Design an enzyme around this catalytic site. Structure first.
Site, short mmCIF file in Angstrom:
data_model
loop_
_atom_site.label_atom_id
_atom_site.label_comp_id
_atom_site.label_asym_id
_atom_site.label_seq_id
_atom_site.Cartn_x
_atom_site.Cartn_y
_atom_site.Cartn_z
N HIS A 81 -45.48 29.86 69.27
CA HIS A 81 -45.05 29.66 68.00
C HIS A 81 -45.34 28.52 67.40
CE1 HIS A 81 -42.99 30.14 64.00
NE2 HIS A 81 -42.06 29.49 64.58
N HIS A 139 -40.90 22.15 65.51
CA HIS A 139 -39.85 22.45 64.16
C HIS A 139 -39.00 23.40 64.88
CE1 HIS A 139 -42.27 26.31 63.92
NE2 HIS A 139 -41.34 26.84 63.45
N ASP A 140 -39.41 24.17 66.01
CA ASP A 140 -38.22 24.88 66.67
C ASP A 140 -37.82 24.66 68.05
OD1 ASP A 140 -37.51 26.99 64.82
OD2 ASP A 140 -39.48 28.30 64.94
N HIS A 179 -39.49 32.49 69.32
CA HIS A 179 -39.44 31.18 69.11
C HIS A 179 -39.73 30.33 70.27
CE1 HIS A 179 -37.08 32.70 65.41
NE2 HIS A 179 -37.87 31.79 65.05
MG MG Z 1 -36.99 27.83 62.76
ZN ZN Z 2 -40.46 28.50 63.17
#
Ligand code: MG
Ligand code: ZN
Ligand code: IBY
EC number: 3.1.4.17
Length: 313
Positions: free
Chosen positions: A72, A106-107, A68
């Site tokens: 990614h 998003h992460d 993550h």
């Molecule tokens: Mg996520």
């Molecule tokens: Zn993700």
């Protein structure tokens, strides 16, 4: 204004393909994102100075975790780019602007732990956000970075357009909570199969954007086998660390997170393809026919996990 990003010939060609891998040269990733924004959205979508400064603050707020991480973020943005580019006329100017940023962000500030572990640990974020805990956090971090001086890439949007783009980004990031995917796809399945799916219905677009976000988020399963296989190592590196932390709280983790049950990985991969991945790329291919290469790549990778269990590799 007249400053285009141009890639080497192999990247310029392969980046348009769904199975493109962004490569191990971290310093090329920002430029790859900018390239995608320019072709997906236009050279006028963002001020280059602000965009570059947004990108580098986003990068700084991803941690050095096995999966993550910043790689990614850009990988998921590239899956979105390939969906948008193969579906030219299906998406608005605001949607193309927002969804690339949504994927990159998003992460944000992910720690390599699930919502479940934050809950069991009793982490401060679990008392602030009872559901989709990390996903509300990723959106919170996105707003905070956009609110840094000279970081507001949406400044040339009107107030209504600005609120619209932050609502697209918020729904897009919350949608990457896999817990929410199962029900979203079922409703999409029914809507397609009864012919009630309507893309001028805002509530329907939200669902379709949601499934696009799940598809981009899981896109490791859509790469050539060697990339899929090596990414799985990084995925399980986070899960097993989390399983270790579970055991420290005096809780046996699920086998997916127990490094003592490494041998069961091939069977766990089959379940996830059959339960999550194939259904996701199938519903997406029905609604957006030109995303078929993801379903095809995913089926090819399912067959490779089947070959692993049969000891053929
Ligand atoms: Mg996520
Ligand atoms: Zn993700
Ligand atoms: C559900 N389940 C269970 C097991 C598993 C069970 C016992 C022993 C080892 C393993 N493995 C999985 C899948 C792990 C997983 C989760 C999310 C992913 C996203 C993209 C690509 C690959 C992914 N793989």
């Amino acid at each position: 204004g007249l400053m285009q990003f141009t890639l080497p010939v192999r990247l310029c060609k392969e980046i348009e393909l769904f199975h493109f891998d962004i490569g191990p040269f971290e310093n090329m990733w920002p430029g790859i994102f900018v390239y995608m924004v320019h072709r997906s959205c236009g050279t006028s979508c963002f001020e280059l100075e602000k965009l570059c400064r947004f990108i580098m603050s986003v990068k700084k707020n991803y941690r050095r975790v096995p999966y993550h991480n910043w790689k990614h973020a850009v990988t998921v943005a590239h899956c979105m780019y390939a969906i948008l580019q193969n579906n030219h006329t299906l998406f608005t100017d605001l949607e193309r602007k927002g969804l690339l940023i949504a994927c990159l962000c998003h992460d944000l500030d992910h720690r390599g732990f699930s919502n479940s572990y934050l809950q069991k640990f009793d982490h401060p974020l679990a008392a602030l956000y009872s559901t989709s805990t990390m996903e509300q956090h990723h959106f919170s971090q996105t707003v905070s970075i956009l609110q840094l001086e000279g970081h507001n890439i949406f400044s040339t949007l009107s107030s209504s357009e600005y609120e619209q783009v932050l609502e697209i980004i918020r729904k897009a990031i919350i949608a990457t909570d896999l817990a929410l995917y199962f029900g979203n796809r079922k409703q999409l399945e029914e809507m397609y199969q009864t012919g009630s799916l309507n893309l001028n219905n805002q509530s329907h677009r939200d669902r379709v954007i949601g499934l696009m976000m799940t598809a981009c988020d899981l896109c490791s399963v859509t790469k050539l086998w060697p990339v899929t296989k090596l990414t799985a190592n990084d995925i399980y590196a986070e899960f097993w660390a989390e399983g270790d932390e579970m055991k420290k709280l005096g809780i046996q983790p699920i086998p997916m997170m127990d490094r003592d049950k490494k041998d069961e990985v091939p069977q766990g991969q089959l379940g996830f393809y059959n339960a999550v991945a194939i259904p996701c790329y199938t519903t997406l291919t029905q609604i957006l026919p030109p995303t078929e290469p993801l379903l095809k790549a995913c089926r090819d990778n399912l067959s490779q996990w089947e070959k692993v269990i049969r000891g053929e590799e």
